């Protein structure tokens, strides 16, 4: 099946590494990204690193020269461990940062991923342009929202768990036929001219937004409104080029007001957004729907999790990338006690300390529970996925619990509790 949402700890992980690589914050101008495409040869890079070393040696300005030699000598030192470029390539990250814990140790990452071709990067600036593998696994802008109405229009975008509206105008087209004499008909002619002026002005600002530089920024574009103010938009001369081509859905909404509008985006998905990461539909919704059925089908955040995960009985696990829960180990003897990301009591659960016995209950440390759920789920026969609170339901999870919820296969019963009668 598509692992969607399972993907979302992994996507997330990359992302540190993209910011930390790009940022390298640490000051100094000694950061080297070296990415070497599949089938290029490693010494063509080693020889360029040695020709740059020999140049770096001419700078002779003790701090600056030492940064650039320390940076080149670190990437060169790692490059030797690899024999050849492997299949899928090499990525290499080296540089001197404002390290912490007075333990120093410039960043050194050196790995094989899966398939960055012809990118071939060597930069030592502020930023490495790692791009086109980063273009290839794009993730862009997402779905286009263009809203007609008789009173005024709207343009926005829902992009992953980014919704953005912030670009609109309004119309009084001429709806008042006028009164005092004149005529009949005249209004209807004035009405069809002023509606044509809205078919020009909505469609143009939609071209001025959604189709940015020589291509539509967004993958998909939905026209929503009422009563063929959008069908005359879609089949028109003024709108067309490359945008008419992209339209996935034409949604009919009511009074068009925001709910209708959302239900619009919603019904939409299903075959569009694409990837398999951001969008979910059909999958996300199933998670929530299936828990609705008083089929106690929820783990949702704050009570039942690890235990049920150790004991088969979960279809899809819903966790967040920003989870403030982990695993701790060290407590009780003759065995082991496990701590979960310590809350108001877990952090200071020193109470379990049996002073009159020795039972040392010192709130462990800190490990990350996010990453473990993304490396185990087959043994239990269950699954795992991830999400965000970017929305109404999202903010529930934080207040109701922390950030971890599960989806029992079939109807199981709400785990009994003292509070329950």
């Amino acid at each position: 099946m598509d692992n969607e949402v399972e993907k979302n700890i992994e996507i997330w992980k990359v992302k540190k590494l993209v910011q930390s690589l790009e940022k390298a914050r640490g000051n100094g101008t000694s950061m080297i990204s070296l990415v070497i495409p599949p089938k290029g040869l490693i010494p063509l890079y080693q020889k360029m690193l040695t020709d740059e070393y020999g140049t770096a040696s001419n700078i002779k300005s003790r701090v600056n020269r030492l940064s650039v030699l320390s940076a080149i000598t670190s990437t060169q030192q790692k490059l030797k461990l690899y024999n050849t470029l492997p299949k899928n390539g090499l990525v290499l990250y080296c540089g001197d940062i404002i390290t912490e814990d007075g333990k120093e140790k410039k960043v050194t990452f050196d790995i094989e991923p899966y398939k960055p071709i012809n990118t071939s990067l060597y930069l030592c600036d502020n930023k490495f342009h790692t791009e086109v593998l980063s273009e290839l696994l794009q993730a862009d802008d997402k779905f286009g929202f263009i809203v007609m109405d008789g009173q005024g229009t709207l343009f926005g975008s829902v992009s992953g768990n980014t919704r953005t509206v912030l670009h609109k105008f309004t119309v009084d087209l001429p709806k008042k036929h006028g009164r005092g004499g004149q005529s009949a008909l005249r209004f209807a002619r004035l009405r069809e001219e002023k509606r044509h002026n809205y078919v020009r002005k909505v469609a143009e600002v939609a071209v001025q937004n959604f189709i940015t530089n020589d291509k539509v920024n967004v993958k998909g574009l939905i026209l929503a409104g009422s009563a063929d103010f959008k069908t005359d938009l879609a089949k028109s001369e003024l709108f067309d080029p490359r945008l008419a081509c992209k339209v996935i859905s034409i949604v009919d909404v009511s009074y068009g007001g925001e709910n209708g509008f959302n239900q619009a985006i919603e019904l939409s998905a299903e075959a569009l957004a694409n990837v398999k990461y951001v969008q979910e539909k059909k999958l996300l919704e199933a998670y929530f729907d299936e828990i609705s059925q008083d089929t106690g089908k929820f783990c949702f955040g704050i009570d039942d999790t690890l235990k049920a995960l150790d004991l088969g009985a979960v279809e899809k696990l819903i966790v967040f990338e920003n989870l403030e829960t982990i695993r701790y180990t060290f407590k009780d003897a003759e065995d082991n006690e496990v701590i979960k990301f310590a809350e108001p009591e877990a952090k200071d659960k020193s109470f379990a300390i049996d002073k009159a016995t020795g039972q040392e209950m010192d709130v462990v440390s800190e490990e990350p529970l996010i990453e473990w759920l993304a490396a185990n789920y087959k043994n239990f026969g269950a699954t795992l996925e991830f999400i965000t609170d970017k929305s109404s339901e999202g903010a529930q999870f934080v207040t109701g619990f922390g950030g971890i919820g599960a989806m029992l296969r079939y109807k199981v019963n709400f785990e009994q509790l003292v509070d329950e009668s």
Partner: protein
């Protein structure tokens, strides 16, 4: 115009031809009197869209509206041989139902309009018309009886017969007693067609008059009362629309009390005031005064466009009110299949405002922290804690406590479209 001139809001399913019917009521009051609209009615009548049963001169006017939403541009009315009537014409899947409740006037009487027939009884027994949510919003303050008109009583296969009417009266009259309202002194019926007429005069030879002895629709409205000489109860004016010219123009009904030219009017939501430069009445205009129950188009001297939005109400500094952002409420949920979880998105229905609302958290149930089970809601014990919740919405909405007044302070919740709950706002918060 001055006062005694109704508050009426049509309600009905979207299919019910309710816009055709509300247009036929607007259609030159004096009766016929119409050297332009008699020429328009000379056939014009429609393409496939609103489709055609004679009532029109108005169904092809939906056609061009572009359409499928609304036929009676949130606009009509007429007068009779008693008084003037506003109209305001619920949804063709529009928002003109929002336009009533918290908008243009609290009907002394609404109206319900229903369309008994094969493919109409099916969609009429779903029953989820612009009656339903659309009388509950409509009832966050007042609007009731409504009479009920049984439209589509000629086209289907009725061929002017004498059956089905009573069968619908029984089912519709159990549907009005639902929720828990009032009696049946206020729930008469009138057979109509939109197709033709009947409701204003009994001067038809229709085929209902051989068996039907009773008053016409308007006579069963006219069993209320009038008043006289404008300036009676407090002044109030809901905005249907705004645009600008020399000064801002606003459109909307007046709810109670008086507007002349050159008074001040206050808009509480914004916190601004203005002088009205002009008043248009609603009928033949010559520079005269108005009344709760006509509209006024008004011109507004010294305020900005942005300062007023539709669904707001203007008054004098004298008998005014106030409102705020997110809030706490005591909401009472019915039997529903779905439970409200903490945070869940419902649609709220205060007033004109239908908006998406997150019921973020659940602060107490009967007396405990749990999901919103309470199917039949309160603590059955002493102080009725149905639930206590916090409701949050996209933009700050103008709402007050129910304690100051029950209007703005009551609202319904519905998840999909089944009404999960009703409550009162207890406290205001930022």
């Amino acid at each position: 115009g001055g006062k005694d001139h109704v508050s009426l809001i049509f309600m009905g399913h979207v299919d019910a031809g309710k816009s055709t019917m509300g247009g036929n009521l607007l259609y030159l009051t004096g009766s016929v009197d119409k050297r332009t609209i008699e020429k328009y009615e000379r056939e014009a009548k429609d393409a496939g869209r609103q489709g055609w049963y004679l009532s029109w001169v108005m169904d092809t006017n939906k056609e061009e509206r572009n359409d499928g939403k609304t036929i009676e541009v949130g606009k009509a009315y007429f007068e009779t041989e008693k008084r003037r009537y506003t109209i305001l014409d619920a949804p063709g899947h529009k928002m003109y139902v929002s336009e009533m409740i918290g908008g243009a006037s609290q009907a002394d009487v609404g109206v319900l309009v229903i369309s008994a027939r094969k493919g109409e009884y099916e969609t009429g027994f779903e029953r989820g018309g612009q009656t339903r949510e659309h009388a509950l919003l409509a009832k966050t303050q007042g609007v009731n009886k409504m009479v009920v008109v049984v439209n589509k009583m000629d086209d289907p296969t009725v061929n002017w017969s004498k059956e089905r009417y009573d069968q619908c009266v029984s089912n519709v009259s159990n549907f009005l007693r639902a929720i828990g309202y009032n009696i049946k002194t206020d729930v008469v019926f009138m057979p109509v067609s939109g197709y033709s007429g009947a409701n204003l005069k009994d001067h038809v030879d229709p085929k209902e008059c051989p068996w039907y002895t009773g008053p016409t629709l308007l006579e069963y409205l006219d069993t209320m009362n009038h008043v006289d000489r404008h300036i009676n109860a407090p002044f109030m004016l809901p905005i249907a629309a705004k645009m600008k010219d020399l000064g801002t123009i606003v459109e909307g009904k007046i709810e109670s009390g008086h507007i002349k030219k050159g008074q001040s009017t206050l808009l509480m939501p914004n916190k601004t005031a203005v002088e009205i430069q002009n008043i248009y009445n609603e009928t033949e205009n010559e520079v005269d005064m108005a009344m709760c129950g006509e509209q006024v188009k008004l011109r507004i001297k010294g305020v900005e466009e942005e300062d007023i939005s539709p669904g707001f109400v203007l008054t004098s500094p004298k008998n005014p009110i106030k409102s705020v952002t997110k809030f706490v409420a005591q909401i009472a949920i019915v039997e529903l299949k779905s439970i409200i979880a903490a945070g869940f998105s419902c649609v709220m229905h205060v007033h004109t405002a239908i908006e998406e609302v997150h019921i973020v958290k659940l602060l107490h149930k009967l007396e405990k922290g749990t999901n919103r089970k309470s199917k039949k809601p309160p603590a059955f014990a002493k102080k009725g804690m149905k639930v206590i919740a916090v409701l949050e919405t996209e933009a700050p909405v103008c709402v007050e406590t129910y304690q100051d007044y029950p209007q703005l302070g009551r609202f319904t919740l519905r998840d999909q479209g089944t009404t999960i709950a009703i409550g009162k706002i207890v406290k205001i918060a930022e």
